[PDB]
Ligand binder design. Structure first.
Ligand SMILES: [Mg+2]
Ligand SMILES: [Mg+2]
Ligand SMILES: [Zn+2]
Ligand SMILES: [Zn+2]
Ligand SMILES: [Zn+2]
Ligand SMILES: [Zn+2]
Lengths: 444, 444
């Protein structure tokens, strides 16, 4: 159960590549606790399967290096995340972000595109909803529009993840449409859910006006304000916040859509590893210093949520690992994994210091990227990258002739730390995670 | 630390897809043992990453199913397997089978193509040579030619894995060539290594005559016999074997090249999932009933080997998983994964009965195959398959425009059962596995 998993020394020498310093048996036996967790932090790297973890490590930390956050969770396993076909109720082997997010927040499988509803379009409570109910503080942070599938699955029950605001819901989720007797669009259900801390992007959807109810006529922003929400739009005002609770819930909207990626790099191209020079990522100049980082949001949320006595449940999402994977952009993809590692370090530090916190880091599904030989002549999109090792690493995206590269169905890594972390070991299902959290918190 | 990891019931219903029937903490705590291992069984699925495991599971057992052998190992983790560039000594992110086999059997990283030698071309003792020196019984079984990288890494030290017999060694590994005063070709070093039980294919190379030494002019097959080896070439004679030890070593040559694949199916094609109908794998009609299956060989090996009082070390390899992945043949690949699972069940059944046996199942590196959506328009080779679920699963191979799909660098699953199994949890390196075994056996 070491906290240092980096190669021991000279990787070309006997035992120099080893990551293990001694015997884990005692150490591991000592990290196995079935006492209840008081808090739970679930970090989700969108689309971050093992391939994505390995490439970012190879790049940012080197083959023999290790993520001080992502790689430091002692209890590990692999979990399945297949979705269901709506008609047949038969497995659909490659899930989308909505059906998967619904799985751990609800504990029930569903079809691709569904948020908070099973294949019968029946609503099921999310873990955030049950937490809030038991008196725990709740947080939801992401680098994507808050209406996006991952953060949304915790506060909304909609038939199509496309129903962001009143106007998309009216036409695509008419039974959820507010003016039709429904609970409302994702943004509206988010505002109703009223989690203590909610941070991310997606401010543009808040400019839509409600079509029915009490705040009908007022934009969703005005409604948030009318309801007691503190609204912050940058790093400065975020840090300024001193409390967030059911009286003064916090709401951060740091971008119209998704928050900017941290690194810039060209898009992978056909024969790019052969015809184009190896690339070295650089910071993204479009991204402002006023826009908080995932670690910053994670840290602030923990500070505000840790004030609650029953405890808290927080979910953090490094959203754009997925987005840049779809875009066949290695740099944007690696930057987002590094960004997430930071958020995991913040969490682990709190967890270790507090001692009753279960921390879980995993991904909702696998994605396109593969690490291939430098000389690979692949049919898809490729790019050579200069790693920290001073060597070249080639990444391939070859599962779509369309612009967007697709998700994949491979089981992926799930790692945990803290009370009830043993339930993540071995083969499990994405729906088991729901039960693991529900029981760790004794949230029954 | 459970044995049944299949979905609980109706996967369309809340909790119906869970694989956990309770809480693992106590169960796992109980499976954590640092007592010495008396025996070790290392099963290797060549090129069997988590993606390969998921595809074969979805196909053979259904998405909510579980491999009774492969998925029944309680302790799990992910391990790295990058090779080294021979000139620079810097990491080569995608390893080949030779460099990877060498890492776990030797404890040192090396370049691609090297067997039993570091980047300096210096020999290092293998775990089989060390067990043999300690008085333990040694077994080496594989479905590939015995001169192949995986089984060979345990008994040969050659600068190029292409140095099979006398002739190839002369031109490619002249410094190993028997005439130039070298230890010999792979086949000759295997003969000299004298493990108690050696079973696989590769009889073709045994038809070569040594160029120098006591048996020069005599075929390698005759030499084996002159040295006291029991030669068996089919199931009947194999099963006939009563004992195998240092005075009566067992040598089984079941095929000229690789042993035949279990299932038949067509090769994936460009737009195969779209232009062609879903395929259903069938048993291989050319596979002679008299050729042993990996499990039968594993079973017989364990039986002969378990007669040694000091204990034994056995390595089993499901070699064609890799080959069929290279060949872009889903059916052959899945069949070879099902094949290996059967071998794992035999291993586990024994381990559970004996109680001082460490069983480990992993792969040497990742591979090409990806599970993609049914409607995917991939630039590579694809194919639709009818699964146990009666659902369609699409497999994609898009990392090579050559005739062979390539290995990939993603970290992959390693699972263990038995004393010292805890050393497999978390992030580790392929070289740690060497140390885990050496320590488990007290083979200092
Ligand atoms: Mg997302
Ligand atoms: Mg092999
Ligand atoms: Zn996703
Ligand atoms: Zn996606
Ligand atoms: Zn291999
Ligand atoms: Zn291969």
């Amino acid at each position: 159960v070491l906290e240092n998993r980096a190669a021991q020394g000279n990787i070309t020498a006997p035992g120099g590549a080893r990551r293990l310093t001694g015997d884990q048996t005692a150490a591991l036996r000592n990290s196995l606790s079935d006492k209840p967790a008081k808090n739970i932090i679930l970090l989700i790297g969108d689309g971050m399967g093992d391939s994505e973890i390995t490439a970012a490590r190879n790049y940012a930390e080197g083959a023999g290096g290790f993520f001080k956050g992502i790689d430091a969770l002692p209890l590990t396993g692999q979990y399945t995340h297949y979705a269901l076909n709506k008609k047949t109720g038969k497995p659909d082997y490659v899930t989308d972000s909505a059906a998967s997010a619904t799985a751990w927040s609800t504990g029930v499988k569903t079809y691709n595109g569904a948020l908070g509803v099973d294949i019968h379009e029946k609503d099921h409570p999310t873990i955030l909803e049950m937490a809030k109910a038991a008196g725990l503080a709740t947080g939801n942070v992401s680098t994507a529009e808050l209406q996006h599938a991952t953060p949304a699955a915790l506060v909304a029950h909609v038939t199509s993840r496309k129903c962001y605001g009143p106007s998309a819901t009216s036409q695509k989720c008419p039974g959820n449409a507010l003016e039709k007797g429904g609970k409302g669009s994702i943004t509206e259900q988010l505002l109703n859910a009223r989690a203590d801390v909610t941070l991310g992007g997606g401010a543009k959807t808040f400019a839509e006006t409600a079509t029915a109810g009490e705040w009908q006529g007022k934009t969703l922003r005005e409604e948030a304000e009318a309801r007691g929400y503190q609204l912050v739009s940058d790093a400065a005002s975020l840090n300024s916040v001193t409390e967030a609770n059911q009286q003064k819930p916090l709401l951060g909207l740091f971008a119209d859509g998704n928050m900017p990626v941290r690194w810039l790099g060209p898009k992978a191209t056909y024969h790019g590893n052969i015809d184009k020079p190896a690339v070295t990522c650089t910071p993204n100049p479009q991204r402002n210093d006023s826009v908080p980082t995932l670690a910053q949001m994670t840290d602030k949320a923990i500070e505000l949520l840790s004030k609650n006595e029953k405890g808290f449940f927080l979910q953090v999402e490094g959203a754009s690992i997925d987005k840049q994977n779809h875009a066949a952009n290695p740099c944007g993809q690696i930057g987002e994994t590094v960004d997430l590692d930071e958020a995991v370090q913040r969490a682990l530090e709190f967890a270790k210091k507090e001692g009753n916190t279960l921390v879980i880091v995993t991904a909702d599904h696998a994605h396109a990227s593969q690490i291939v030989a430098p000389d690979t002549k692949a049919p898809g999109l490729t790019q050579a990258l200069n790693t920290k090792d001073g060597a070249v690493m080639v990444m391939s995206y070859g599962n779509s002739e369309e612009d967007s590269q697709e998700h994949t169905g491979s089981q992926l890594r799930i790692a945990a730390y803290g009370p009830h972390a043993a339930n993540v070991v071995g083969l499990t299902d994405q729906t088991d995670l729901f039960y693991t959290m529900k029981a760790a918190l004794g949230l029954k």
